[PDB]
Structures are given as C-alpha cells and as structure tokens.
Design a protein around this ligand. Structure first.
Ligand SMILES: CC(C)CCC[C@@H](C)[C@H]1CC[C@H]2[C@@H]3CC=C4C[C@@H](OC(=O)CCC(=O)O)CC[C@]4(C)[C@H]3CC[C@]12C
Ligand SMILES: CC(C)CCC[C@@H](C)[C@H]1CC[C@H]2[C@@H]3CC=C4C[C@@H](OC(=O)CCC(=O)O)CC[C@]4(C)[C@H]3CC[C@]12C
Ligand SMILES: CC(C)CCC[C@@H](C)[C@H]1CC[C@H]2[C@@H]3CC=C4C[C@@H](OC(=O)CCC(=O)O)CC[C@]4(C)[C@H]3CC[C@]12C
Ligand SMILES: CC(C)CCC[C@@H](C)[C@H]1CC[C@H]2[C@@H]3CC=C4C[C@@H](OC(=O)CCC(=O)O)CC[C@]4(C)[C@H]3CC[C@]12C
Ligand SMILES: CC(C)CCC[C@@H](C)[C@H]1CC[C@H]2[C@@H]3CC=C4C[C@@H](OC(=O)CCC(=O)O)CC[C@]4(C)[C@H]3CC[C@]12C
Ligand SMILES: CC(C)CCC[C@@H](C)[C@H]1CC[C@H]2[C@@H]3CC=C4C[C@@H](OC(=O)CCC(=O)O)CC[C@]4(C)[C@H]3CC[C@]12C
Ligand SMILES: CC(C)CCC[C@@H](C)[C@H]1CC[C@H]2[C@@H]3CC=C4C[C@@H](OC(=O)CCC(=O)O)CC[C@]4(C)[C@H]3CC[C@]12C
Ligand SMILES: CC(C)CCC[C@@H](C)[C@H]1CC[C@H]2[C@@H]3CC=C4C[C@@H](OC(=O)CCC(=O)O)CC[C@]4(C)[C@H]3CC[C@]12C
Ligand SMILES: CC(C)CCC[C@@H](C)[C@H]1CC[C@H]2[C@@H]3CC=C4C[C@@H](OC(=O)CCC(=O)O)CC[C@]4(C)[C@H]3CC[C@]12C
Ligand SMILES: CC(C)CCC[C@@H](C)[C@H]1CC[C@H]2[C@@H]3CC=C4C[C@@H](OC(=O)CCC(=O)O)CC[C@]4(C)[C@H]3CC[C@]12C
Ligand SMILES: CC(C)CCC[C@@H](C)[C@H]1CC[C@H]2[C@@H]3CC=C4C[C@@H](OC(=O)CCC(=O)O)CC[C@]4(C)[C@H]3CC[C@]12C
Ligand SMILES: *[C@@H]1O[C@H](CO)[C@@H](O)[C@H](O)[C@H]1NC(C)=O
Ligand SMILES: *[C@@H]1O[C@H](CO)[C@@H](O)[C@H](O)[C@H]1NC(C)=O
Ligand SMILES: *[C@@H]1O[C@H](CO)[C@@H](O)[C@H](O)[C@H]1NC(C)=O
Ligand SMILES: *[C@@H]1O[C@H](CO)[C@@H](O)[C@H](O)[C@H]1NC(C)=O
Length: 901
C-alpha cells in the first residue's frame, strides 16, 4: 500500500477533493434546510411504554367530533335530529399574565418609595415603549391618544389621589398612600371587592377604590409582601417592582425588543431593568445563534497558530484544518441522504467545537512519528519510510479515534430523539475524520519536501526550551516526589466518589419542560424566570395552586405508537381501533363492579358533587327509574337491544339539559362515525397534588398501575384495556434521562476497558489504566456537580463522552511502554515520558484553548461545552501523567502478557 502514497500524492489528493466536492454539492442541493425555530424539539421519549399512551391520548384529543363532517369520534351526531364592561377609572381590565411586563430594581439605597424612582418608571415607560410606533394598544376608548395608561405604580398613586396623571404629582399623595398601605396591609383575609359604587359583603374598610389595594399588593410590587416582623416604622424597603403594558405578548412584540432594549444598560441612574417578559425567549433564539458564530471562528484561527508552531510548516496545518472541515461535510452528507432519517436537532451544532478539539489529536502524533523515522535511517526511499511510520502510527490513531466513536455511538440506546441523532452524527464524523487522517495526511506529508534571523533564533530558543522541559526536568519532578501524587490523587478520588454517591448527587431537573434555561444565566429573559417568577405573589399563587392529579381509563383504542420512531421527524402518528364489544350485559355489570371497587381505595379522593366526570354507566342507570317515552322498569343488565338506543337517547338528553362544554376531554363515551359505541373513557380525582418532584410521582404511578393492572374481566374489553394514563410526562422525561445515561455510561466503560486490555496485552497496565479512568470520571463529575449542574439533554451526553475522552492520554503512555531498556520501574519510564510528553501536552492544550474560547458566548450549550472541555482536559492530562507514571512502582519486566499471537 505504501507504494501508492509514495510518488503518487496528487492522484489521491485530487480523488479525495472530487469526492468531497460532489458530497457537499449533493448534501446541499437535495435535502431541505433545517428549521432551528424551536430550541427544544426532540425532548420527548418514544416507545417507553408511557410515551405510547401519551401519544395515543393526544391523538384521541385531536380527532374531536364536528357537527359538519366529524369524520371520526362524534358524540351523538348520526342520530341527532335538530329539525367590568364600564369604560371609567382609566383602566380597561384587571392585571393578568398575558401582558408584557418588566421589573425595576438597582436603586441607590435599595428603596424606591420616592418621587425619583416612580418618575423614572414613568419616564422609561414613556421613552422606550410608547415612543416606538405601535398598533397593539387596546384603545378601549375610541380615541387613540387615550389608548391605555402606562400602568406604573405612579398611575395607582395618582388614581388614589384626586388629580390623576403620569406626570403631575403632589408628593403628598405619596405619603397618603404609604400610610394607607401601612395601616390596611394587615387585611391581606380579603379578595377583590369590585368597588364599582360599593361592595356587598361586610368589608374590612369602606375606603377601597376599584380593587386598588388588592391590585397593588397582589399584581404590582410584592417583594416584602408588607407583612413581615420588622420595626413599626411605616417606611419599609421594597426591592423589586413590576410594570405591565397593555399590549399583548407573543411573536408580534419581538420588534420592540430589537430596537430599544438590546444595548441600553439602564435608562436612569436611579432605576434599571433586571427582568423582562415579552414571551419571545424561544423565538428570538435563532438570531442570537448567528450572532455567536464569532467565538468559534476565532478559536479555529488560534488553533492554526498553535499547529504552525509545532509542525514548522503552514501547508500541513492548512491541509489538516481542511481535512477536519471536509470530514464534517461528508459526515453531514452520509447523515442526511443515505441514512435516510431527517432531523437536525441543533445539538449537532455544538459538535463542530468538539471535532476541532479532537481532529488535531492525531495530526501531531503522525507528524511526530514521521520526524523520528527520518532521524533514524536518513538515507532511505520514501516508500519504506512511509510504510514504517504507518505501521507505527495507524493502530494507535485508530484506537484513540474508535474509543471516542464508540462512546458517541453508545447514545443510540436512550429513548429521547435529540440524543439519538446527536450520537449518530458525532460518531460518523469521528470515524470519517480518522479515515481522512489515514489517507489524506500521508500524501501531504510526502509532498511536503521543501527579520529572518530574529524569528529563527527565537524559534530555536523555544524549541530548546521545550526539549529541556520534556526531556530532563519533567521525569525528575514526576519520579522524585512519587508519594505526594499518590496520596493527593487518592484523596481527590475519594472526595469525588463521596460527592457523587453520598453528598448531593446530580439532582434531576426541576424547571418545567416549557421553561428550560436556553440563554446565559444573566440575560434578562432568564433572570426573570429564575427569580422574579418565584418572588412575586400573583404568580406564586399559581405555583403549586393545589391541583389534584386525575386518573383515566380507556378501553377503545390500543396503545400502539407508529410514527417512524427511528429518529422521527418528531411529527406524524396514527390512531386505530380494536375488536372488543361493550354490548354484552356481563360487560356492563363488570364496569359497574369496577367502579364500585375502585371507589374502595386509599388513593381515590372524594368530593361528593360529581355529576358526569365519573363513570357514565352510573349516571345512565340513575337516568332510569323513569317512564313515558322505549324501555322502562327493567332489571339492571339489559339485552342490549334497548340499550343500543337508550345509550344515545340518555346522552343526548343529558347533554341538552346540562353542560356548556363537554367536548374533547370529558369522559362521555365515544361513538363511531355511523353507529356504535367504540371507546369509553372514565376518570377519577386522586389525592397526590401533582408535585413536580420525582419520588412522589414514581410512587403514585407505580401504586395506581399495579392496582389497575389486575383485570380478571370478561372476554371483551379486557385485552388492551388497562390504559392508566394521567398527565405524567415530565416524570417520563426524568426516567428516560436516568435510564439512558446509566446504560450509555455502562456500555462506554465496557468498550473502553476492552480496547485498553486488547491494545497492550498486559493486565498489570490495564488495571492502572482503569484506576486512572475511574479517578478522572469521578473527579470531573464531582467538579461539575459542585459548580451546580443537573441532568438535561446535554449533560446526559457529556457524562458519556467523558469516558471516551479519558482513555486518550493513557493508551499512548501504555503503547510507549515498549522499548529497549530493561529496568522495571525507574527504567522504561523516562523513555515514554521524553517521547510522548510533548505530543500529549500539545494535543491537550489545543483543545483546552478551543474550549476556553467559548466562554463569552450567549447561548448556553456553548458555555457548558466550553467549561466541560476545559475541565476534562486538565483533569485527564494531570491524572494520566502523574498518576499513571507514579503508580508504575508495581510492574516488572515480565509481569504478564498474552498467550497466542
Ligand atoms: C482544493 C484545495 C483545498 C486543495 C488543492 C490541493 C492540490 C490540488 C494543490 C495544493 C498545493 C499544490 C502544490 C503547491 C506547489 C507546488 C510546487 C510546484 O513547483 C514549484 O513551485 C517549482 C519549484 C520547485 O519545485 O522547487 C509544483 C506544483 C505543486 C507541487 C502544487 C501541486 C498541486 C497542489 C498539491
Ligand atoms: C476559517 C474557515 C476555515 C472556517 C470558517 C467557519 C465559520 C467561521 C463559517 C462557516 C459557515 C459561515 C457562515 C455561513 C453563512 C452565513 C450567513 C450570512 O448571512 C447573511 O449574510 C445575512 C444577511 C443577508 O443575507 O443579507 C452571514 C454569515 C454566515 C453566518 C457565515 C459566518 C461564518 C461561518 C459560520
Ligand atoms: C463500531 C461501529 C463501526 C459500528 C457501526 C456504527 C454505525 C455505523 C451504526 C450503529 C447503529 C446504526 C444505525 C441503526 C439503524 C438504522 C436504521 C436503518 O433503517 C433502514 O435501513 C430503513 C430502510 C428503509 O425502510 O428504507 C438505517 C440505518 C440506521 C440509521 C443505522 C446507521 C448506521 C449506525 C449508526
Ligand atoms: C457550529 C457552529 C459553532 C459554527 C457556525 C455554524 C452555524 C452556527 C451556522 C451555519 C448555518 C447557519 C444558519 C444558516 C441559515 C439560517 C436561516 C436564517 O433564516 C431566517 O433568517 C428566516 C427563516 C424563515 O423564517 O424562513 C436564520 C439563521 C440561520 C438559521 C443560520 C444560523 C447560524 C448557522 C446555523
Ligand atoms: C474508503 C477508502 C477511501 C479508505 C479506506 C481506508 C484504507 C485506505 C486504510 C484503512 C486502514 C489502512 C491500513 C492500516 C495499516 C496498514 C499496515 C501497513 O503495514 C506496513 O506497511 C508494515 C511496515 C513495517 O513493517 O514497518 C501497511 C498499510 C496498511 C495495510 C494500511 C493500508 C490502508 C488502509 C487499509
Ligand atoms: C459514572 C458516574 C459519573 C455516575 C453517572 C450517573 C450520575 C451522574 C447520575 C445519573 C443518573 C442519576 C440518578 C437518577 C435518579 C436517581 C433517583 C433519585 O431517587 C430519589 O430521589 C428517591 C427515590 C428513589 O430511590 O427512587 C435519587 C438520585 C438518583 C439515584 C440519581 C443519582 C445520580 C445519577 C446516578
Ligand atoms: C469506572 C467505574 C467504576 C466508575 C463508576 C461507575 C459505577 C460503579 C457508579 C456510577 C453510578 C453509581 C451509582 C450512583 C447512585 C447510586 C444510588 C445510591 O443509593 C441511593 O442514593 C438511594 C437513595 C434512596 O434511598 O432513595 C447507591 C449507590 C448508587 C447505586 C451508585 C453505585 C455506583 C455507580 C453505579
Ligand atoms: C498536581 C496539580 C497540578 C493537579 C491539579 C489538578 C486539580 C488539583 C485541579 C484541576 C481542576 C480543579 C478544580 C476545577 C473546579 C473546581 C470547582 C470549584 O467550585 C466552586 O468554586 C464551587 C463554589 C462556587 O463557585 O459557587 C472549586 C474548585 C475546583 C473543585 C477545582 C479544584 C482543583 C482541581 C481539581
Ligand atoms: C500553561 C500555559 C501554556 C497556558 C495556561 C493558561 C492559563 C494560565 C489561563 C490562560 C487562559 C485562561 C482562561 C481564560 C478565560 C477564562 C474565562 C473566565 O470566565 C469567567 O470569569 C466567568 C464569568 C461569568 O461567570 O460570567 C474564567 C477564567 C478563564 C477560564 C481563564 C482561566 C485561566 C486560563 C486558562
Ligand atoms: C501556546 C500558545 C501558542 C498559545 C497560548 C494562548 C494563551 C496564552 C491565550 C491566547 C488567547 C487567550 C484567550 C482569549 C480570550 C479569552 C476569553 C476570556 O473571556 C472572559 O474573560 C469571559 C468574560 C465573561 O464572563 O463574559 C477568558 C480568557 C480567554 C479564554 C483567553 C485565555 C488565554 C488564551 C488562550
Ligand atoms: C493553567 C491551567 C493549565 C491549569 C489550571 C486551570 C484552572 C485554573 C482552570 C481549569 C478549569 C477552570 C474553570 C472552568 C470553568 C469555570 C466556570 C466559570 O463560570 C462560568 O463561566 C459559568 C459556568 C456555568 O454557567 O456553568 C467560573 C470559572 C471556572 C470555575 C474556571 C476556574 C479556573 C479553572 C479551574
Ligand atoms: C376630590 O374629591 C372631591 C370630593 O370628594 C371631588 O369633588 C373632586 O372632584 C376630587 N378631585 C378631582 C381632581 O376630581
Ligand atoms: C450606561 O452607559 C451609558 C453610556 O453607554 C452611561 O451614560 C450611563 O450612565 C450608564 N448607566 C448608568 C446607570 O450609569
Ligand atoms: C366501600 O365502602 C365501605 C368500606 O370502605 C363498604 O361499606 C362498602 O361496601 C365498600 N364497597 C364495596 C363494593 O366493597
Ligand atoms: C358506516 O356504518 C354502516 C353501518 O351499517 C356500515 O355499513 C358502513 O360500512 C360504515 N361506513 C364506513 C365508511 O365505515
């Protein structure tokens, strides 16, 4: 093979170039452009035995009945034969959470009860919001000039006074309202009085305006809550104050934020803006993404310089960077076209950075080996030199790349879709980059055969410095101490294990699915949702608003998920039916007995006022004991000939008599299009309060499912029947994250250990390598959990990639343990050090820098990836070198080897 790369470089160069050009061209032309519109799109498990039920339930809700061509699941249609408002008080409506808002703080002295702060609120509202051309104002009064007031606290100060305006303040109404709140705050024990002209019930005081006090304490500023155990001084300090806006929130608002809020720190010296809610956190996202392609580019540039210092040429560095980019391109082509599945979950974006930190990890090695094979046997042909260097470097480069490739492929086990796609893409990228490192680089190396004094002398100075560093002093500083490092790293390993296994481990996520932190942790959009949603009362009351958890039993459809689950488009499913029957009287009696028994439990909650949300057979039987209509005065289980008609007549009569809305969620039995009772749906109220934690939800699900699983029913409606499905999907996400992470970590560790054992043929060295990998994993994850982290759809992949990146700085030191000198421990170490220390140090430094350049970004994935890469590379290099070399006091010259070659 070596004869090919020799004397024929341009051939393979042109061939690879044409292959890459056609690959890029097809991959750009044929498939469609990715969306990036939704930052979170694949974060839903599939085929987890609960995701199937959630999908089937959401499909059942989708196909509601319609008066005109229901076309599926109508309620009764085939047989159906039909033939506040005042404009006074300057305000439109009570405050709600469907209007845009901001929050002011950061005053001098931490107190805003003063004319400056209120006037600044009014001024910034008039300047940054009203001045922009806007048509979203309510304009309750037909006059556009009186569209709506600014809704500040000064407006309430004014309306509590006789003269009302945003500007004209007397400074006496301020003190009046301060005393008013100081004396009537204890009444908040009360609710909205609706003081149009007076209130009905016995009120605490008859000096209440149109819900003035209740609004100012409930919806507006509520930091202190005005009921603490502080001093009797009627002047307490308030921290944060919220200000609404009459216009609605949504994608329409985004324009305003583009113009006035991006660059401006604070409008006034006395007030600032520390939290904003316009409802555009997930729509603006895409834009910032583009704005943060600066930091990657710079990183790439820096990398080049480093290589241009190590490999003295620039040709090699340029061709290596081209090889990496080419690998990304051809990997995308293999991803979208031949593999045939279509989804680009934006996590693949953060793949680029990773590859830049791993593509060079081999280049150096190759070049290095070449130079060595050039020092020995100087007078030689290119073919034999190429064959020698290939035999010396190919196996090591393949092990180094394939371990990480396997670690990235092992994420094809988890159920989430984003993780699956990211794993497949990154694995293919790494393997293709290895193939290019084996084919493209030898060609360019062979082909490369070709104030100067100052640059040359300083470069030689740097070269001799690096040589004397990695050749003399590092072996001494590593092998002389030899006892501080052992105990130090054992202490660090034990501490990491204690932080991962005993003291607070990686807590499962707590924010809801719709409120994932996507931007930086200091952006206004994120600071609001992190703190001020929890510090204000009008949203804290909704937070855990005593919502009980429902049950749901369905017999019609079958829990069958068929939506191309193999990396789906995350779209497209289908419903279906079954072959049971509910017509037999035995089935009716069994349903009655099932309801009677299910009410005899400890998880069922009782309310005494259920009309129809409970079982329908009970309400139907209650509709009996009547006549003059046909069937009356019979036994309970009927011959179903009358029942087929009575079940329509009764449901029609009841839906006519009561029920303003009974569609798409109510437990009424579901008919087919023409004539039958296809599906039935029962629901009950439980007593578990819908916590957001994991343990309680797990307990509830396990208990209710284990109880309802026992059916022992008639032949019809017994199979495909159980179908307990509550609103538990966040618990599904948490469980899927946990299981996927565990299994992927296990597989990655197994592959790493197997490859490390098969590459050296020595168990004594494999054991030390395993100890080092374990220590690195433990310390890295301990540091990550100390900084404050939690399992998400990124850290779950990072934990698995850490194992793959760990063995890198150990396979090389194990391979470099094959040499001529005999001495067991104090020998055969300086050789490996002086030979591979420079390569390992440079290979770690380049990815350290390429990861550290991501810190100033704004998107959160970039920051997290940067800090993780920095941490893992520092810790892995330190452990590998110091530990692995220092713990070589236990190996001899013929400890152990393999049996048969
Ligand atoms: C598509 C891009 C990204 C890669 C293109 C790769 C090749 C088509 C190019 C890249 C650099 C080129 C080389 C740049 C310089 C030279 C030296 C040139 O000879 C001289 O400069 C004369 C003096 C001497 O040889 O001493 C002969 C062509 C050659 C080998 C070129 C051959 C074609 C090469 C390998
Ligand atoms: C240094 C070399 C070897 C690699 C460079 C990698 C990146 C820094 C490059 C590759 C893709 C480039 C992007 C390709 C396309 C676009 C869209 C382009 O969009 C517009 O010009 C929008 C305005 C308009 O179209 O009128 C702006 C530059 C940008 C983000 C480019 C920015 C620079 C990127 C990220
Ligand atoms: C150690 C390494 C070399 C092992 C192989 C790793 C990857 C090359 C493999 C692992 C799992 C594979 C995937 C497993 C299953 C599928 C579904 C498969 O579906 C079909 O073939 C559908 C055919 C049709 O109906 O048209 C397409 C390839 C794909 C994505 C595979 C692509 C190649 C993958 C990523
Ligand atoms: C992997 C990173 C570290 C390097 C840079 C690559 C990406 C960050 C670049 C390459 C392609 C770029 C995209 C190319 C085209 C578009 C479409 C563009 O669409 C619109 O402006 C409107 C679309 C519509 O609504 O129809 C928005 C920016 C976006 C997503 C760009 C965002 C930035 C992207 C993803
Ligand atoms: C799909 C295409 C474009 C690329 C496929 C990759 C092959 C071109 C690579 C993959 C692994 C390579 C092999 C890896 C290692 C060796 C051992 C090497 O052994 C020697 O020359 C021994 C020299 C000595 O005695 O020191 C000979 C080349 C060879 C077979 C390599 C030949 C090129 C191979 C087959
Ligand atoms: C290889 C090393 C780095 C560990 C990698 C995994 C850990 C970083 C994470 C992933 C899954 C996590 C677990 C996911 C779920 C749970 C159950 C959770 O259970 C409860 O809260 C109590 C009720 C119960 O025991 O189920 C306690 C934390 C724990 C063990 C977590 C502990 C930390 C784990 C093992
Ligand atoms: C190279 C290898 C050796 C690295 C380490 C891999 C495993 C040996 C680690 C990774 C995750 C660890 C687990 C993380 C969390 C737990 C839960 C812990 O139990 C609880 O937290 C129970 C809490 C409760 O009572 O609700 C017991 C240890 C265990 C199983 C740990 C056992 C050791 C595990 C499997
Ligand atoms: C022989 C020497 C050169 C070895 C050096 C390697 C370790 C001793 C270093 C490298 C990574 C360092 C860690 C990187 C990050 C952190 C997290 C950091 O966390 C916090 O500061 C938590 C509190 C907070 O900031 O809110 C505490 C220090 C620590 C554990 C560092 C401790 C020292 C570590 C383990
Ligand atoms: C051995 C030689 C060749 C290199 C040694 C490099 C270190 C001495 C320096 C150079 C780059 C430095 C980093 C450059 C940028 C940052 C980001 C910086 O970020 C913040 O302060 C976070 C701000 C926030 O919380 O928003 C923290 C320090 C850090 C990691 C620096 C840590 C110290 C580093 C690694
Ligand atoms: C070995 C030779 C060839 C290269 C050595 C490079 C380092 C000496 C320098 C050059 C570029 C530096 C980086 C340039 C920019 C930044 C971003 C900077 O970001 C912040 O300070 C974060 C601010 C924030 O929190 O918003 C942190 C230091 C860092 C990583 C620097 C760390 C030190 C680096 C890598
Ligand atoms: C000089 C080099 C060769 C050896 C010593 C390196 C340490 C001084 C570096 C390595 C990792 C660094 C840490 C990497 C990341 C962070 C997170 C950073 O906080 C953020 O930017 C936000 C993090 C987040 O949001 O998750 C604060 C600095 C810190 C602890 C860095 C502190 C300095 C550390 C320990
Ligand atoms: C203040 O109150 C008096 C009597 O209650 C009323 O006549 C007067 O109009 C009020 N002030 C203003 C500016 O309306
Ligand atoms: C914000 O920066 C501007 C100049 O860019 C400055 O005039 C203003 O005083 C700053 N804000 C504060 C609160 O000082
Ligand atoms: C359920 O309620 C009480 C005991 O909880 C009992 O009198 C009644 O008979 C029970 N019903 C059934 C069907 O067991
Ligand atoms: C509608 O129901 C009638 C019942 O007799 C049946 O004959 C017919 O095939 C049904 N049509 C469809 C499209 O299911």
């Amino acid at each position: 093979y070596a004869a090919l790369i020799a004397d024929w470089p341009v051939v393979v160069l042109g061939m690879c170039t044409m292959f890459i050009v056609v690959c890029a061209l097809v991959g750009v032309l044929v498939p469609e452009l990715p969306d990036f519109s939704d930052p979170l799109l694949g974060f839903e498990p599939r085929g987890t035995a609960i995701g199937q039920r959630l999908v089937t339930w959401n499909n059942m809700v989708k196909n509601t009945g319609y008066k005109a061509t229901l076309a599926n699941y109508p309620f009764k249609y085939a047989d159906e034969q039909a033939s506040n408002f005042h404009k006074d008080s300057f305000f439109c409506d009570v405050p709600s959470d469907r209007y845009s808002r901001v929050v002011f703080t950061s005053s001098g002295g931490e107190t805003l009860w003063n004319l400056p702060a209120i006037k600044s609120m009014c001024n910034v509202d008039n300047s940054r919001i009203r001045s922009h051309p806007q048509f979203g104002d309510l304009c309750q009064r037909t006059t556009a000039a009186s569209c709506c007031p600014s809704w500040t606290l000064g407006n309430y100060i004014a309306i509590l006074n006789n003269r009302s305006s945003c500007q004209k303040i007397v400074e006496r109404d301020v003190s009046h309202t301060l005393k008013l709140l100081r004396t009537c705050a204890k009444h908040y024990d009360m609710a909205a009085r609706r003081k149009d002209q007076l209130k009905c019930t016995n009120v605490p005081r008859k000096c209440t305006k149109y819900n003035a006090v209740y609004q100012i304490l409930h919806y507006l500023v509520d930091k202190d809550f005005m009921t603490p155990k502080t001093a009797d001084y009627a002047t307490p300090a308030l921290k944060y104050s919220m200000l609404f806006s009459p216009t609605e929130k949504g994608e329409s608002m985004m324009n305003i934020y583009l113009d006035n809020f991006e660059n401006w720190n604070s409008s006034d010296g006395v007030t600032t803006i520390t939290g904003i809610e316009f409802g555009i956190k997930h729509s603006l996202f895409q834009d910032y993404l583009l704005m943060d392609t600066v930091y990657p580019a710079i990183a790439i540039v820096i990398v080049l310089l480093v290589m241009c210092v190590y490999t003295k040429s620039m040709f090699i560095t340029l061709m290596t960077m081209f090889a990496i980019i080419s690998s990304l391109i051809v990997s995308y082509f293999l991803y979208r076209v031949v593999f045939h599945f279509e989804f680009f979950p934006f996590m693949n974006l953060t793949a680029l950075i990773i590859l830049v930190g791993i593509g060079a990890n081999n280049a150096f090695v190759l070049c290095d080996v070449w130079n060595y094979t050039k020092f020995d046997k100087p007078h030689a042909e290119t073919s034999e030199t190429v064959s020698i260097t290939l035999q010396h470097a190919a196996l090591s480069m393949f092990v180094t790349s394939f371990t990480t490739a396997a670690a990235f492929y092992a994420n094809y086990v988890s159920n989430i879709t984003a993780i699956r796609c990211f794993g497949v893409y990154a694995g293919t990228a790494i393997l293709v980059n290895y193939v290019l490192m084996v084919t493209w680089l030898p060609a360019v190396v062979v082909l490369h055969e070709r104030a100067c004094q100052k640059c040359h002398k300083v470069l030689f100075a740097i070269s001799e410095a690096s040589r004397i560093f990695f050749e003399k002093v590092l072996p001494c500083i590593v092998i002389k101490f030899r006892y501080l490092w052992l105990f130090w790293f054992l202490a660090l390993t034990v501490g990491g294990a204690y932080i991962v296994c005993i003291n607070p481990k990686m807590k499962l996520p707590s924010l809801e699915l719709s409120e994932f932190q996507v931007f930086r942790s200091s952006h206004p959009f994120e600071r609001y949702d992190a703190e001020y949603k929890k510090l204000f009362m009008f949203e804290r009351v909704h937070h855990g608003e005593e919502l009980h958890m429902p049950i749901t039993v369905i017999w019609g459809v079958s829990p069958e998920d068929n939506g191309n689950p193999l990396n789906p488009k995350s779209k497209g499913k289908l419903t279906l039916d079954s072959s049971f029957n509910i017509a037999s009287p035995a089935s009716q009696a069994w349903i009655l007995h099932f309801c009677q028994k299910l009410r005899n439990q400890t998880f069922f909650y009782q309310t005494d006022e259920q009309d129809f949300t409970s079982c329908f057979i009970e309400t139907f039987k209650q509709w009996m004991e009547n006549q003059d209509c046909c069937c009356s005065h019979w036994s309970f289980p009927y011959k179903q000939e009358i029942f087929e008609l009575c079940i329509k007549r009764a449901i029609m009569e009841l839906e006519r008599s009561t029920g303003y809305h009974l569609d798409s969620k109510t437990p009424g039995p579901r008919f087919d299009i023409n004539d039958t009772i296809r599906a039935v749906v029962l629901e009950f109220q439980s007593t578990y309060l819908f916590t957001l934690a994991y343990e309680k939800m797990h307990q509830f699900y396990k208990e209710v499912d284990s109880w309802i699983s026992s059916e022992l029913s008639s032949a019809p409606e017994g199979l495909s029947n159980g179908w307990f499905v509550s609103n538990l999907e966040f618990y599904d996400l948490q469980d899927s994250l946990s299981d996927g992470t565990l299994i992927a970590m296990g597989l990655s560790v197994a592959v790493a250990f197997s490859v490390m054992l098969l590459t050296t043929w020595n168990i004594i060295i494999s054991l030390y390598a395993i100890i080092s990998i374990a220590g690195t994993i433990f310390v890295t994850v301990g540091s990550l959990v100390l900084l404050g982290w939690e399992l998400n759809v990124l850290e779950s992949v990072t934990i698995s990639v850490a194992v793959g990146l760990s063995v890198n700085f150990a396979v090389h030191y194990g391979v470099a343990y094959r040499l001529a000198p005999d001495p067991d421990r104090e020998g055969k170490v300086i050789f490996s050090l002086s030979r591979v220390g420079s390569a390992m140090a440079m290979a770690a430094l380049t990815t350290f820098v390429a990861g550290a350049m991501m810190m100033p970004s704004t998107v959160l994935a970039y920051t997290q990836l940067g800090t993780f890469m920095m941490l893992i590379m520092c810790i892995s290099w330190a452990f590998a070198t110091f530990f692995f070399q220092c713990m070589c006091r236990c190996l001899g010259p013929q400890g152990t080897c393999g049996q048969i070659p």
